[PDB]
């Protein structure tokens, strides 16, 4: 099961060390860097797991309702998310690299990984992450897993998460 | 078993991209970018692949023997490589640097991971790794694999000792 290791790695050699100064990291974005109105930057790293492993080269081609906003200071991008073509959040997204992997594998012919093969991995993948996550200590409010399947919006699914 | 998506995340992720255009810039290099009375950098991927899993963070404080030279142009590295106190062989030369999982893992308590869990996932990746590398289209003749468990006497192993082996062969 290559999911054990992809997760394992994602927490152990990222996860564990960005998220104990992420909050602070977003309170100096909030207090000297933000120029934008009420719209103030969520306290979690929001993690965009697509089952389908497809991993875009930006952000914004994949959703025209997700919009580059900034580099959070001190490698993390700030986006805005619309919704009735307004801003309605800002937060710190990205996507669960490792997932790559998965997709690369299923198109490699002598890696013998089925579409089918890859989604039980990406699904593993994510028990696995919430997991880990769910008894580690340097995440204990600041990790959002945003796991998802495909007219669908990434934009809406980001913002139920950042009503949560 | 962690070792299975490593091994092919190390593949798939990175070899499968940097091997077929290594010995164009490794050739590049000797022509252009080389100091003329110096040895010519071989043409492979050296792979150190320790199976304690320790990756050094610089490569020459591992070994006194293990000199870095220059960076290879267009995030690989350059070594020469001394025996006896003189200039033996030259190099592209890295660790398996996914291989960081699994000494970060053996010490963190909550993966309930063990030093001889830790040997067996080693085992496990330099294992997966050599075969899917043997079916891999891009690994020409321009990477090597070298997979090292270092004795308990250190008087009986040496790591530039273990690269110029490889390196003659
Ligand atoms: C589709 C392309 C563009 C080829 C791709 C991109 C990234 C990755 N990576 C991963 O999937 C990956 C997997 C992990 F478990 C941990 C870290 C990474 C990292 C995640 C990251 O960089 O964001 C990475 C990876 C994979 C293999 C590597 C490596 C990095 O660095 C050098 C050693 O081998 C893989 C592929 Cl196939
Ligand atoms: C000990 C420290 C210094 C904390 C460490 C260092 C590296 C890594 N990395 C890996 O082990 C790793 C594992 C893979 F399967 C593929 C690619 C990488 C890459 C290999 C590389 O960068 O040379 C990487 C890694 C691990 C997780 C990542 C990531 C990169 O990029 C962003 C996503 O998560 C892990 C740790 Cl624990
Ligand atoms: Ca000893
Ligand atoms: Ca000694």
Do not use: K, M, N, Y
């Given at each position: 099961?290559?999911?054990?290791?992809l997760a394992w790695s994602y927490y152990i050699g990222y996860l564990r060390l960005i998220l104990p100064e992420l909050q602070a990291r977003i309170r100096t974005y909030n207090q000297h860097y933000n120029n934008l109105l009420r719209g103030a930057v969520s306290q979690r790293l929001y993690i965009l797991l697509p089952l389908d492993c497809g991993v875009p080269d930006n952000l914004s081609m994949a959703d025209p309702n997700i919009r580059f906003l900034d580099k959070?200071?001190?490698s993390n991008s700030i986006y805005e998310l619309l919704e009735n073509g307004q801003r309605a959040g800002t937060c710190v997204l990205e996507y669960a690299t490792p997932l790559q992997t998965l997709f690369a594998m299923s198109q490699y012919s002598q890696a013998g990984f089925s579409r089918?093969?890859?989604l039980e991995q990406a699904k593993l993948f994510c028990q696995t992450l919430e997991?880990?996550?769910?008894?580690a200590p340097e995440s204990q409010n600041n990790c959002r897993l945003i796991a998802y399947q495909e007219s669908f919006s990434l934009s809406q699914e980001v913002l139920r998460h950042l009503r949560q």
């Open positions: 099961s290559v999911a054990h290791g959070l200071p001190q089918e093969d890859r997991d880990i996550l769910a008894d």
